[model samples]
Target: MLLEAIFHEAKGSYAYPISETQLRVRLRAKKGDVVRCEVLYADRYASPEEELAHALAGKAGSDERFDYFEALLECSTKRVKYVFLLTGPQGEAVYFGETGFSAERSKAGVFQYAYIHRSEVFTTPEWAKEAVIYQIFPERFANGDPSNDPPGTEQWAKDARPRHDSFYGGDLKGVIDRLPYLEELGVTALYFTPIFASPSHHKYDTADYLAIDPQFGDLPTFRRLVDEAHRRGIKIILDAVFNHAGDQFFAFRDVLQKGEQSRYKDWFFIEDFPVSKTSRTNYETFAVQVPAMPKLRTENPEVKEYLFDVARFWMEQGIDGWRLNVANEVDHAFWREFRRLVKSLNPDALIVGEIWHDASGWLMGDQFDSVMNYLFRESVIRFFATGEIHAERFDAELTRARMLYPEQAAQGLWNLLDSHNTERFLTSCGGNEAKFRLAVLFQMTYLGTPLIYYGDEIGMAGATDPDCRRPMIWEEKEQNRGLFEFYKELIRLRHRLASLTRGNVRSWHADKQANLYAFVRTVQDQHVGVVLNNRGEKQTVLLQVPESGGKTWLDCLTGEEVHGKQGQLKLTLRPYQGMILWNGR
Candidate 1:
């Protein structure tokens, strides 16, 4: 056994309470180094006879350097202590605990989890786990009421070269009109970019939290959209731009006019007394000193209250969740309070932070429920689009992603392929529809909620932001009907297949040289295996899956049946093809 690879802790992902009476503990060891692993655990105050042991024998998971072993140990009492016993293939036993590894069992100091608090266990809205989300940039989605078009709005074009300051008069009424289309596509949720009053088309900088953007529509029209969407079993989540307010925002305008005498001087981060947009500006802004958007003083109690109330007001309007804008830059204390308030109003309401990296700090059940999951997006694009990584590296990246948080948070993460912030996935794949289809297959089958950016199902491609935010295709003849049909069918499968949405994931196979990878998601004995071929030539691959006694498996995409033998099955896949098979009848 390699001692350097052994690692564990009593807090965070390594050891966390999954229930009021049980703790999920994880241990990492060098891959293929240990053959057997077990945990001796009991209540910290229990007598010697009261102690119990559970085997951590299954392949919990593995990254590049280490294989993770885990087990859910039930606690006799709320408080517990535990130690690990790892046995190598050569039958050498090593004891590990807080005091470090030991050949003698007596020297291994037990790791004590003082108590399992009810509030501490990571929990999420059950509906969120299985959600098929459709993300829409409101201004570019559609234009139902063309009369509500903003001044200087251009005609809705299918092949328009967009600018940073572009508009197509997409409105809430348009969304309301498009409800039938979304329902037909089988998405369970809709998440929109900012819809509040702002001067910009994207509305990332908020001018008024309480009012809907005039270009979008009035409050009644939004409420109608919400009601119509809920009628079709689709939940609505609006973006909350709390990180900054627009230059036209009342408080900021007052600061600019009154200078030092402005009573709301503390609301923003102004550098000098005279607030002016000179060469570089005097105050901090959202991203790289945008003079139009001034960063809010989130740590201030008044600012926190105002922002929290904005969230509450939206919840009152029957919105299902809040997708926070630039959540990482804000203080954690504010988010904690924000969570407290949102859950108080509705326990099922979700709080998703717009964080582009590892956001474990905010996902500990106290701040946000999930993040935008942009890191996962990076890994997917890198593997499928750019070919910068192979099958082995992709699997390793996936394992590392899962290890970043509790299993529940991992399930709640918004696993996105592309969003308004980046180039479309098809664009990233150089408009290769085959590669784009393979990436979508992985996105639909992978753990966590799969977010489909607007126009992707119709095979829209664009370079990056402003371009990515182009108008949604409405003409059936102009759309990629085949891709739309594919998306619709896959989304329906995601809703119907339990294991595909909420299940334990394990590696089925991976080959770096072959550029093929596969994984199985299992819920009990039901197994759904997803296999991918990333190259441009036909390749035969064997994937190891469970229940291979020559049992029949159905292809989820094509409805073809194949048999598995000795826990493996061989299939010849076309160039850049992706397959999904299920063993459960």
Candidate 2:
């Protein structure tokens, strides 16, 4: 019966509260072993109450080893206890719980979900899922005020090359001036890299946590940008660089001067007494021998208090949220308290962590609302940019990632194609704007928030890191108007479609031979289907649904209606193209 293959967890991904009154419970079993599964649930406090029997729907994701069965458990008391009943392929029934498989449903193995407190319910900000985030590298976005330009700042030109230290005088005032452009693009949120006081062009290492870098303008200018952005319904999320401090940071500088006598010596890891800037190996830095960025010991009470104050101060400035940098390196206890502090001030404010890997630990409703979703970017790069994998592998990668966490965390993810760290998508696709458009279409229509790197909408191309940080193309003559129009239209479609962002994934069809990948998202009676062709070859697809028979579906990208006959839809798409079909009951 493959009893050893059945698995269930009482918490985390397997069982977690999705809302105040409802809990989503999941059970994992060997692939194709169990025919049906059901949960017998009741309030833990209610002794005489009847256990409600609810059937769990089963589905196998991209994983080849296991099938996941899930059901939504509604609790009247918000406190629940549950057990599972499994039916084998041979129609043999068995009761499974915390202990093990048993013929009798005994109290010894009943899985108990003690409570679902309102505060503890895994929740993300509602506005976060609806937002189309635009990531702006502050030093290269624009140059609205040239007076505050850093000494030896490069001229803002379309062909100008960008180095690590190059700055183009982009500032908060510049962002304020471009609010109209962002408004037209239909982006609902702006995520900026570290704009705090720092010496380098990219301000990952902060000299002053509270004050803005002079190159990026002052407190007043930042405040004005936030206010003006809010006026246009655009929220602001500033990058939080609490992991390390720049070489000029006051605490690190104090430690360097006073050595053993310095009270701030404990704020950072010091290998031995008499610290020097050259002794990078002696003390712990952000990376190997990186003396410029000194890693902060977050476990220190004073360090925790200081960083907490920095977070609180920004919230007071009317910022929407924080995108934590090097969040994976930081301690979980620190982030838990950070989440508490941030949520205490504003429950609606978003907290996104810059974790480039599987972030199940931080995404269990305790620390971060979402993560950077680098796996998503990697998958997109492999399929659309490098063509390293076929559509089947691409769908598997996505489905595997989605199953690793709760549903809400997937929606809160910052699904980006490329950022300041990676090469632009166009450059990654070998300067093929056609392929980049397909990736962008998927990003805009898929789950989670879409992040457009600065200058990507204007079709600017560059390599990784330093090159990807090129200044925005302000000249219309040099910009790719076709690509810009495509981005604008996709964003507009995203804003208009309610089901795209708010719906749950229904099904996925990955046809490797045809280089085609498709997925459906359903919320109530509204359904949205997205189909993508990653290659340069034409392919025809057939979409079938129970409700699709004899119905008219609208192609969101082309604004053309395709008819479905007998629960099947067949359409031939152009080379390197995608389509979004919308159906309403």
Candidate 3:
């Protein structure tokens, strides 16, 4: 046994409260080092003589360095103290605790979890777990009402790439017109970018908080759109831009007009009495001297009230929730109050923040429920687009990323392949449909909520930013109907398998040289498995899925069946092909 590889901690991913009563503990050891592991745990206040032991199963993650062992303990008293016992293949036993390895048990050196508070437990909306989200850039989606189009709206073009100043007349009515299409596509939610009044077409810079942009219809139109979406079982989440305001915003305009004498002078951070556009007036702006957007002073009482009122007003208007922009820049105190107000009005509403990296700080159940998972996008690009990593490295990175947050927040993470800010996934794959299809398959079968950017289903390809923001291709002959059908099928499979959405994940196999990866998701008796081959040639892979013992695992996509022998299922996959297998009648 490699005693030096044993490791565990009482906090972070190693140990956390899955619920008010259940605590999860995990231990890590070098790959193939230990044969079996068990956890001995008890309530910290309980007598050590009454402690109970539970076996922990060793499972390989996508990493080549270590294998993780996990066990969930039920502590009705809301406290836990634990340690591990490792058994090697030669029948040798080793004890591990807070201090280190020992030949004999040491109660004094055991790790302890002092308490579990219900308020601190992470949670997301229950309805959002199985949701398939469709993200829309309103200006590029569709043009429903030509009359509501911006003054200089360009004619609808199928092959036109958008620019910062371009507008294609897409509006809320356009979204309403496509409700049936979205419903057909099996989308359960819609996430629209900033639609409030603003000077720019992207609308991230908010000129007015209360009113809807003329290019995206009025408040009544938005209300109707929400109602219609809800009728079709689709929830609408709007973008909230509170970190900064556009130069034309009412308070900022007042500051510009009256200098330091304005009543709203304290609304923003101004280093000088008079703000200048041409010269450096020493005013704090968003992203280094972008004079058009001035950062808000969220610490001020009046500014807090104004932003909170904006949140409340939208909630009162029946919007499902808010996707915060640049959420990491705002103060945590403000978000705590924001959560209170939003939850007081609607407990089921979700709060997803725009964070690209580790968001454990914001997911403590007080500020935000979840965040946009750009880390998922980066991994996908590295593996499928650039071929920078193999199957083993990909699995390891994904496992590490998922371990950053609690299970509740993990389920609500907004996993996307591409967005308005990055190049399209198809373009990233160099227009190879097979490679892009494999990436989409992994996304739908993996943990978290899968988000599809608008036009991505129809095979839209662009470089980045302005280029990625192309107008929706409405022409039937010009669109990639096959890719659209593939997306629809994937969504259907996701809804059909409950385990795929809410299940415990464990790796079945990951081979670096062979470029093959497989994992199983199990919820109760419902078992599902996914296999991928990223190599350029056909390959035969054997996966250890005990859930399919002496039974047949049916492919949910192609309806092909494979039989398992002695708890192992053998499969042969084509290059860049993937499979979603489930044990269903």
What TM-score would every model get versus the actual structure? 0.97, 0.95, 0.94
Q: Write the per-residue lDDT of candidate 1 for residues 1-585, one digit (tens) a residue.
A: 888888899988888888999888888889989887898887798786764666564668898888889888888588998989999988999888989889876598889999988998888888897999999998999898998898888877788878999788999999999999999999999999899999898887788999999999999999998999998999999888888899888989999999999988899999897887744878988878688899899998888898888888889989899898888999999989889899999888988988877788987778899987777888899999999999999999999888888888888789899888888999999999998998888888998899999999998889787788889989999999999999998888888888989887888788999999898888866788888988899999877654642367888888888887777788989999888888764
For candidate 2, what is the TM-score? 0.95
RMSD value for candidate 1: 1.5
Per-residue lDDT, model 2, residue 269, is: 88
Best by lDDT: 1
Best-to-worst ranking by TM-score:
1, 2, 3
**What C-alpha lDDT values do all the predictions have?**
0.87, 0.85, 0.86
Worst 10 residues of 3 by lDDT: 55-64
How many backbone clashes does every candidate have?
A: 0, 0, 2
For residues 1-585, what per-residue lDDT tens digits would candidate 3 score against the true structure?
Answer: 888878788876677887999887778888778888888778888775784756565553534577777788788889888878888888998888888788787842788888999876666688887999999999989889888888777777767867779888999999999999999999999999999999999997799999999888999999999999999999999998999998889999898899889998888898887877853646788888777789999999999999999888888878888899999898999999999889889988889999876788888678898899998888899898888998888888788777677677877788899999989999999988899999999998988889999998998899888999988888889889999999999999889898889986777778999988887787888788899998889999887765433378889889998887877778999999999998873
> Candidate 1 clashing pairs?
none
Candidate 1 at 324: error in angstroms? 1.3
Ranking of predictions according to lDDT: 1, 3, 2
